[PDB]
Design a protein around this nucleic acid. Sequence first.
RNA 1: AUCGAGAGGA
Lengths: 556, 484, 82, 115, 117, 67, 260, 92, 46
Amino acid sequence: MGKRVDFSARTVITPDPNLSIDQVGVPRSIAANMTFAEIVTPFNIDRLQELVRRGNSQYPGAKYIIRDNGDRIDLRFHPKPSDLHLQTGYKVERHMCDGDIVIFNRQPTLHKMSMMGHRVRILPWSTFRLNLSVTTPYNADFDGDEMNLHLPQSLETRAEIQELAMVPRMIVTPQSNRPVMGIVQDTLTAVRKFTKRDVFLERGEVMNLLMFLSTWDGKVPQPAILKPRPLWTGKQIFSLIIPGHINCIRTHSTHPDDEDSGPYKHISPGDTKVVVENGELIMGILCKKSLGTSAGSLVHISYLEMGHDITRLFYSNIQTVINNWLLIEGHTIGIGDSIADSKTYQDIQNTIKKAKQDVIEVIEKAHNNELEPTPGNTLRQTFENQVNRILNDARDKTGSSAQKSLSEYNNFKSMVVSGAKGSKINISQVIAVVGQQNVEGKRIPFGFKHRTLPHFIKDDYGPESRGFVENSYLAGLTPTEFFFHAMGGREGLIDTAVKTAETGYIQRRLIKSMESVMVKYDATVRNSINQVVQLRYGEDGLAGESVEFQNLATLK
Amino acid sequence: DDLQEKEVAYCSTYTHCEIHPSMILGVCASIIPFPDHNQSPRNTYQSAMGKQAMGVYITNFHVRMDTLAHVLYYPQKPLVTTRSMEYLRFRELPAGINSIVAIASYTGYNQEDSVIMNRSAVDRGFFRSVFYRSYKEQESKKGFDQEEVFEKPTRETCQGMRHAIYDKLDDDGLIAPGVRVSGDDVIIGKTVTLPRYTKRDCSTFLRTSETGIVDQVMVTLNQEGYKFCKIRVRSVRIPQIGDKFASRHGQKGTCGIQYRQEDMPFTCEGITPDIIINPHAIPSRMTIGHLIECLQGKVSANKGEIGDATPFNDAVNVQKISNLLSDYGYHLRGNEVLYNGFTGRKITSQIFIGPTYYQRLKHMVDDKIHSRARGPIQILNRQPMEGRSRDGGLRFGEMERDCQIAHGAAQFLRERLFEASDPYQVHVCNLCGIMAIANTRTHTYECRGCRNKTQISLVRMPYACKLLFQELMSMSIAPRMMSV
Amino acid sequence: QANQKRITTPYMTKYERARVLGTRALQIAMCAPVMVELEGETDPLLIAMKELKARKIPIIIRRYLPDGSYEDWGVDELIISD
Amino acid sequence: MNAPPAFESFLLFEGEKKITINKDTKVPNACLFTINKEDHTLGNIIKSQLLKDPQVLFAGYKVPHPLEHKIIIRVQTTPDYSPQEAFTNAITDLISELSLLEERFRVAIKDKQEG
Amino acid sequence: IFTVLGIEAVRKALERELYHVISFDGSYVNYRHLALLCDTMTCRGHLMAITRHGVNRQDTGPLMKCSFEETVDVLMEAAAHGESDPMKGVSENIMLGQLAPAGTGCFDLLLDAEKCK
Amino acid sequence: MIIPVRCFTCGKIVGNKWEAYLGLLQAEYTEGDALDALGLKRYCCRRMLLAHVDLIEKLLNYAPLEK
Amino acid sequence: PYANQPTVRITELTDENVKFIIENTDLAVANSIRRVFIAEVPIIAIDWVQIDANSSVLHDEFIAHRLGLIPLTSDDIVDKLQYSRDCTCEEFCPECSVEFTLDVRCNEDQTRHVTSRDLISNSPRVIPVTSRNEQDDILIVKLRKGQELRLRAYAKKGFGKEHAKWNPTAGVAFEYDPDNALRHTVYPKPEEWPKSEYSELDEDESQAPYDPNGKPERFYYNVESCGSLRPETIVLSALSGLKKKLSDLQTQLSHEIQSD
Amino acid sequence: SACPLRTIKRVQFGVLSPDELKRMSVTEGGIKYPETTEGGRPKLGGLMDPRQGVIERTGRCQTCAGNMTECPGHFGHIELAKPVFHVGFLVK
Amino acid sequence: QPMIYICGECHTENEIKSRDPIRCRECGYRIMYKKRTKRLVVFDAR
RNA sequence: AUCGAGAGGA
Ligand SMILES: [Mg+2]
Ligand SMILES: [Zn+2]
Ligand SMILES: [Zn+2]
Ligand SMILES: [Zn+2]
Ligand SMILES: [Zn+2]
Ligand SMILES: [Zn+2]
């Protein structure tokens, strides 16, 4: 059920925004080592002859001539001129060339998207180059990751891989009726900044961006502003990037809840409420919730309306054009993004001190037997629960204060609203308060005799003793907080390193249970024994990659 | 400070004091600058990753014939250092170079934990290093039936002779220091007397795809009293795409691309960063210590000092650093106005830049690349070998077959598990179902069980299945192959 | 089973399309006559794709029903979804 | 192991032409210029000078891959003009500007030294 | 729930509990997958656990069961009882190095002599 | 191990300033003052000198293999 | 439809760097000139080392690379010398390379510093910059009693586009619009940013008012030299090289047009 | 090579009977010598049987004249002195 | 033809041949290193 | 080449 396979390679993976999503970059050494057997025909007789005369030394060549009788000619060393000649029945194992179909794989292989078919693009250096958007299905990154590239050796295998496992065909998962690929960090932040209402591109900038649009008719759109100077908006360029005439209505991550209630519903003051009409981005700022893996997003609507090839070109055009615009705009991160204002610092301090005073009040009430337990809980249970409630309220309030203090130029906020990376909790921990460190769901245990650390007094249930990191990452933690945070990180690492074996066993058991279940030609679902399990697949008889969420108009 | 009388008395009965709070850290954790501004898993990752950092592992490396040794060209002590490093002796034996790091999005090749290295810096020696590999070989005279000797093999006497070149040796069967030896090249000429006549070649070749240079060789006698040889082969490894680098705060990545100096962004002064890292790496990992170290590095480079990144120290904070940085004509937050190298236009967002200590991990792509196309196979089963060192293929395991099953690629599954792994065929008696004794040359097929010579069929199936069925037969089970 | 009636779907499946394309490509690469006018094509995959789009594939699909029977469909008799 | 030679970025391979003229079909009076062993150093100046021309409707340049060593410049001109002529005029004007700048720099250098 | 209400009731309970587990954190899985797993766990009239004790006790095939678990034990059971494998499954054909009756292998191709004109 | 010939970032020569830098250090000059005296205006070159450890002197302690 | 009419203005000219302002030119032209400064200026550098003997603590690659980083006087001989690719002679000749020789033995007790003075060349005009008749000599290697270096080196012609050792600039400072009149950079807080060296503003103001009908002009330069060439020679040779490249492109374009 | 190519549609298991084992075993009389080989040459009745298969490369099996690859392993037998319990079939 | 080795302790240039004990005449050391080759190996400063 | 162990990477 598993064995070493010939015609495979493994190298470190490296980002390549200039490759299409269905394209993979292969080092020339791997292509020279691998071969594919091509049957000689009068159509390709000349090219095959050129390859064999070139030989195994030069990369665009071959090292084997397989005669119809069976004997193999090894062209690596001393190619005899007599047996160099080849006929129609022969086949020659030529080196891997551009456009060859290869199946790319990353371990561990969890879903079927963990193995996709890619088109070979020979590149100079010595790594596997992969487009950034095809990363998410592979659960990959570039801190030393490696991938396995298997090369089919037969025409039928190549054709079936092309017709089933191509990356464009693997965009939408039947697991959750949603795209597995979307827009990733840099392009996502860049499109969020690009589709803002106040983005204006000059003539040369627009032409340079259009040089990177594959599906461009060659007509420059009329600028959104003609006088006093011609200017194109980012929404116009992205409208021309959008394929076909797909319609879509989405929402940005900063859209207020009352905007759809009061006036200006259809004219957003904040440039939220993404609307695409006839393939044109009429209004709105795009983010993860419009260019990501969520169901109903722009890429999902594109895949459902147009084809997989059109969606593939959509992904590639988005990445390339907005990367070239980021080359002009820019994006960074640094200390200045982690600094709040003096008033905000004051607010943080107020939230903290007040919380400490409240916890002291709870401790005094507990010591005076004035704390009546809540039903269903013990007195220490009630005491802790309310202490943790106070601390969590303080942490949430200080995080909200940090978010309010954040300005429109903050890179933390930019990468968070774009959905590329980070979160409100990360901003809060960087700026205001790291928060309570918890071990096994409770506070730091009394490892010593009624003491968390020997620097405290016995029976001290204050926030500092039990592991409430009062400082932020920017300020720096006191050593007791450092030790408590180390405990928390150790717990996270323990969970990560422990759960894997159980999860893998569960996956193996599920697949060995269901592995032979298949949809039959009478549209029934039967197992190997032929025992019916579902008269109709999914009780309706539909695949999972073609359905979508809808609303029933007569129920409510 | 905790002994001073305050408005509210917490303890007031202290019996001991710590010499310094930073003593709770270890050896690979004291290298971290500003560890209290980092997330704990990042501290653990750096503690594990410092042991992989590349530098001068020992002063007397010219005499130590270790099997593997990576030595950096130009190690530098960090501009931002901790006080524990003085006792750690990391200043005397550093394992990294202070690099001008611009945290920016540039051309998209630094995405997802990837770095952009300045090509011109690499041509100048930036993170260049040497790789040392030692080969051992001894002549054993344990028995007169087969004895080894160091001699130059000739094609007219030796049997096990490869296609490699044997002219690189001296008459003592040894290579001399200072000879460029490529992959599959002879460095030790050893012939053992046969029981292609009276001597079988047992030479030791160079490692695959090395193309190094013989550094020095050492001839001696071992405990048993026989000749002992050690050969050190030196190879220079310029940093390139696919090489792993890390900061001191658990920020690892491979080299996405190498741009020349004219291609890199630059400040008003001609400062092209040596390394560009993605801004997206920080918010998820909360490595604020990385940014503080960059700021302190800029301050220290401007001031001509070595910064103090002791973990718990109120004397130094980010703001002070900013003030000191602003006193040297720079933005207090460390941002700079960069200019696009391709177009020369200003970059709209001012870019964070500054010196940050970086390490070159021992993870060189050159030791991870491997491809297979019909190489050697095992002996128990006719399946491809294991390990790039033995030219073995990749494993198409149970999860891979699982995903291909979900795909429905039956022909690809058959190609992977049977055609490209271990194609095999066997003759089976149609009645008994047991493998039949069939001669290909004379086409006389027999089955000693059923005593038949006509009802024999040919079935194609993996060698592993044949071995499994033969093992079951040896276990008294009779798996009968019925093709009717 | 009478040829006048059939219970399977009239649409070619993705697996049927992939295997038909692969088999016809192998046949073409093994010097089989072509059923389309090759403008300048020289690769079996696109030759087979052109033949499929022309509905001129000389292959019959034997759809095996679970009961043990089979229904034979020509490639030209099946709607091509893609 | 697969490190390309250093001189590959500017040295022309034998049998490979420096420039290539292709015609755009999507729009009239447009052409694609593909220049090998060149980079932004020439692309940006040629694009800007083409943008100077009032009869050049479109002028843009790109590097398809930083690992490759070729540039593509797209020029679309007025119906009475030709992209080839626009490219030639842009190059000639850049030559004239560079000559004038070099002469003026030599004059300024001589003046600065002589006082 | 099974022993008090029935196999169909336990099928519904299994579906709802598994959905609770899956969607407690907000993640989504298409209902057909859950339904198929629940019917596989239920179609044989009793709660077939996803383990050796449940899967191997079904008459799927000795080679399937030897691939799953208790390889020697199931092979000896098959040998002592004279069981036969119909080779109707997928793992059996994978073991024998044949085209699995999966996806592209679920049908057969025939040459159209008439169309060759 | 030894002082690099050029600054990594800008390429300015720094391989002829190590001995002078050491002499200035022994002449009671501050490190920054010595860097300014050697005309190291850019902080890249200032790093290249200030962060350099000289292991060639330690390596010169061991006796040569060949006499 | 025609070319610009640029003007130069040299503010500071020393033996190490040149300061000049180019007016009335395009940003593309200015950045191209800077890029050619960095990468397309031919100078002479060592590219062929044959170590006869080396008992030092640094290996042969280490030594060779350090020797290659040593700059040499390329002021006038760089034009007469031709690339070895185009040279019709054998591997080396006087018209495409410069010979070098090093022979140092440390026999005294004191540590011997092998500096660039030990580099002896056949060409009198091609010598190490530190050996030209202050700055000390570049340290190649240190030798103790017994250790000895014996090598032969060849200095070829190349530009920084091949290797960083052929780059003749120690920093090319480039800046336009010192006051942010064009709003190319958006400052979230302008008051935090120090004024440029060429800024013309009062302390109460941070950046110039927005100029809606302005384009980058008045490009500032500071070309620091590594000693291979004088800064004026660097600028002149870069302008000539850019002109030559445009000329070859024009010739190829004319040939391609004639082929159609 | 003239055996027609067929696919196995059925795998029937069972216990190898002693008579079938004795009939199909290539070695006659069973293995009685416990040593592998004598003087290099393989023992005719020992474990290193010349009839049970091929020993080394560039050699041919006695039974079928096959090389390292084209020679499947040929099966042997040992005549036990007295009956022996089978641990795998012990519960059976 | 002498094939002189170099001692590891006293660095005496002593000549050894095959079928001869691995010893240093001057100091009796059992460790010696081979002399550098005289072939013209070429390095490109890069 | 086989076994076993250890250290590691994702
Ligand atoms: Mg990773
Ligand atoms: Zn039989
Ligand atoms: Zn510098
Ligand atoms: Zn010459
Ligand atoms: Zn045999
Ligand atoms: Zn001695």
